[PDB]
């Protein structure tokens, strides 16, 4: 049989390797520029190195968002093309949507797990937490927006190429993305707690509990996967079991 | 590295460090080192900083390039944090051992329960050798010799590997067959009757028995290998402060101002030498920064870091205050070191106040220390 | 050797459909693993990571109480998802394995190879036997309330005995400057933590109402009791996390919740396939 | 000049019906204005009125954080009501205008003309630019979640720069008895408050973990972040506030929720009118 | 004693309060010591008389930056001016919609035909203009204030 | 009418009370302010509401 | 009856009782009895035990077999 008609993985592999390489570059930058230029925040070299990296992030990540979102929204499928979609192409597009979810979740892993214990690790070799500490630059200003772009792009693709997502609003997906998304504004709570009487000594402090509540939204993967599996079963019934296409357009109507 | 960010008024009126010696300057790996000093807790302790009822003396190292063999405040081992008294002087000694080669700025800090870290002066210390040659041989009360770098390393990794292998087997016995879609269809169309496998039940029973047996066996093996163990130690450390030294100098601050578009600290004081021997001021110390004159230069540690020493201490009358004489003095601490440590940042402080240590010497060389504090007024030279 | 061919025949999958299902599994399962790593690691470290990081924070009062209560949360929800949707009993074990993978990666690359702390000083360590026994209880009982009770008891009780082989040797006494310390305490003092002073340790301190010989035992039961609650609560949270509907709209512009249903799960659909 | 005749023709209103609708508007809108004045004023003063009353309470930590979080609540609910029911984008601006009207009335008649405090010492002041930008965001985006994010950011960020022209001149330094004060502080000390001593001020105090040059900026972002949450929550509260049903009963005496529906909004009702 | 502070039990203190007459009349004038958690501790009182007019009251102060002000009339026109400007903008924004059928016809059209006829391009132009004006006014006011008073505590 | 009563009770005669709370040593129970609102404005709007 | 359970370090470094007299040894119902003594509050007060800022002198009786007519620390009721 023909694999290529309902499966493709080049974009997924490219995104995975690119994200891994970006994380490795961030790790190398931290290990090369933190002890020599990141100890004092008032030194000119600290500016030139770490605030330069911060500026690079602040200029590149909006460009990343613009390019990705504009490409996704520009090559959109009209309502006519989403109504007579080939179900094999729909299986391929659902695979693509799962791969976008995988890239988004890899970004969330980089932001919330790896570059967070590495921060606790930095919080113990410094006097007190700053605001643009080596760690922050790579995650707060780098990893955080990174996964957010992927999250939007993921939903974007789905509600642009998947008719069902263009029809109704995938409630679970909304939360799954909004969670880590809203995690980035919680840096304000983090800084406000650190700088004032919410204490700073503990890493598992009550001011750090905004991140856990906002990342609990990542558990709506259950609903996301339920929708994906239901559509996959319907597509399997339509394509291979010679069943009627009416099961694809019956339950998500007004 | 960060102390300048800390608001001046706070550090200036919290811990007043003095007589700080770092040594040796260059040490090889596995050799001993020492950081000694004294600090005065200022009577003008800022309201923002909480009282030092739980104080831990810490080391501001870039990383654990030194292993803290011991820390002693006065003469009491300060492994556990404890209370310190405001207006009293303390002595500290930190004994360390070289671990990681390189050049590292090594500080003194006093961590207070609610106030936070109060960093102190810093000096560059050099370690020459290799981190893979580091050994820290300790002897336990039970009578075993260990190395702190490699202790309980194989045990934890071994138990982690065993339990992780069991967990990976449990996970992967199911990730070897159709697992998401066919199961969902069968369950949604036919129930769970075909989804339950007796072989899985046998595996579950065997693995549960193995898990319980392993927990019990590991606990019994550990309790048989180490019959005597002590819990995690806690409590508080307690040491009497250094006795109050008699001071023949009494100082009352009348005025104080600092230049906002500049670098200067001008303090007007009334000094009284109620002793019996002439006394001459020679040094003003605050936040580790030292302003000295000829008198202060006469009694100066030649090995103190020169990046925190400024010869900029000027008096209107640089004469020795005769015994039984009250004099009005105006001290002027002016140097670029004020810009490096940001005396400039007092304009955005919710409490515009200065503090420091003024040091004076007798004709015979005896030293008197006075903790001075007051409100500073901004002077706008740009106008 | 299990019964996979019977399951596939009951699902009525042609060979291309079987291959497509296998590709779905091979794509989605690593995604779920990585998501569990990231989110569970964040939740655990920001609720109970402080006792996790350091050897001298592993005490008899707060560590064996805080750790299982925090750990049971994601385990209950993921077990709900897997068991209810696909009848898969490896939820809690998968959660703890993902947490340990993330923890080991960060300890080796963050704490050790960047911050120069020794590896033995940052053993997390394990929470796996309780998750395994919880999974076994859920599979053998098939009831989630009996699972809540018994498995939460197991999860809260087996934490300390399962970690004792790792951190028991660290409790050997040492005498430094005429003062008695546990070897974990001297390890904590030896390796300087500029951001973590001694007084921030939330560890036992003794009390006049305290029975020192029973402390851990009491901590073993309280942590169990709350677990029996927490599981249950998060089990219901699982039903919240599996909510999968769409906001569809038409005409006046009214929005209605709509659910996409599985056609194979209907009354007569499987019989009409042939 | 807008499109009002087309709207009236689409509504199928005879001229007497149009006049009756105009009378309904002229009667109900002042009632809504007065209700907003009263209730929003009470809520704001009893949650954030202390920083509102006095010049020396307007600090860099608590005022720019507490004020927008308290202010966004009624704005989100009233915006929900107006936009969802009538497609009217002036909710938050109306709320803040009503709050300011009530505040000015009470300051002139209560604080000044009864308690003899100067008017300049009791400037509230404004919170209007953030509400205006929130309204503009809601109108231009038409999505209430994007509105939540962007408009809450605007509401939390524009508070301090918008109030700086009013209270910036009050921060000029003065020297009294050899002590430096802000002019707001000396105004507070000059005019005796028998019930309000100095120590009750919940204002910044500095910390050893604090970056004095960034304080307001941090306070500008935290107040923004919570706003993005608060809006959303109160938006759902709007759906609670628009719940309009009756407890009807019949026979056994059973009570059932019943909704009165608009006949014009039905499927074929407008076509059958003619 | 501009800022509250700690006092010692069993110790004696002296106080002096310097005041300036503002409002005429006869007034009982007390001493009080407000304690953090205890509350007010009022003291003895005596009747003091002020003769004159409240409209003759002036309190001339001199600031560190070198300006003379009156505490009774200080930053009065500035706050009222900014309040009037922003309130006028808000009133215009509110009243541009309260000039046409606003409650019932809109409800009927929205419930029977959707929001297509309820969106007006002129309202979009007004919204864009007002948003640009609001952002520009915020930035301009901030810059004007920071240029007029470079030094503030 | 009910909402006008609520405005009088909760907005006007409440900041006027805060205004009174600062010219007196401590809050009483029948302070000038209270009488007009607590015992006057409060029941007033309540009657209108029921009516 | 329970004091031995109390951790030694705590009691050992809290209240140091001394010169304690109980009497009479045998008394009839409705007769008077007295428990007298002195105690030193140790300077090495353990961190686990809070400071005695609210101290009540109590009697550890099996039950109210005695009615506490009075308790006086130093000479203050
Ligand atoms: Cu951090
Ligand atoms: Cu340094
Ligand atoms: Cu009152
Ligand atoms: Cu007894």
PDB file of N, CA and C and ligand atoms in Angstrom, chain B residues 1 3 105 107, ligand 2:
ATOM      1  N   UNK B   1      29.515  40.895  43.491  1.00  0.00           N
ATOM      2  CA  UNK B   1      28.760  40.641  42.234  1.00  0.00           C
ATOM      3  C   UNK B   1      27.256  40.700  42.523  1.00  0.00           C
ATOM      4  N   UNK B   3      26.115  43.123  45.035  1.00  0.00           N
ATOM      5  CA  UNK B   3      25.988  43.903  46.296  1.00  0.00           C
ATOM      6  C   UNK B   3      25.651  45.365  45.961  1.00  0.00           C
ATOM      7  N   UNK B 105      36.206  35.348  43.016  1.00  0.00           N
ATOM      8  CA  UNK B 105      35.987  36.446  43.968  1.00  0.00           C
ATOM      9  C   UNK B 105      35.221  35.866  45.115  1.00  0.00           C
ATOM     10  N   UNK B 107      33.575  36.129  48.864  1.00  0.00           N
ATOM     11  CA  UNK B 107      32.950  37.096  49.740  1.00  0.00           C
ATOM     12  C   UNK B 107      32.526  36.565  51.080  1.00  0.00           C
TER      13      UNK B 107
HETATM   14 CU1  LIG H   2      32.273  39.323  43.862  1.00  0.00          CU
END
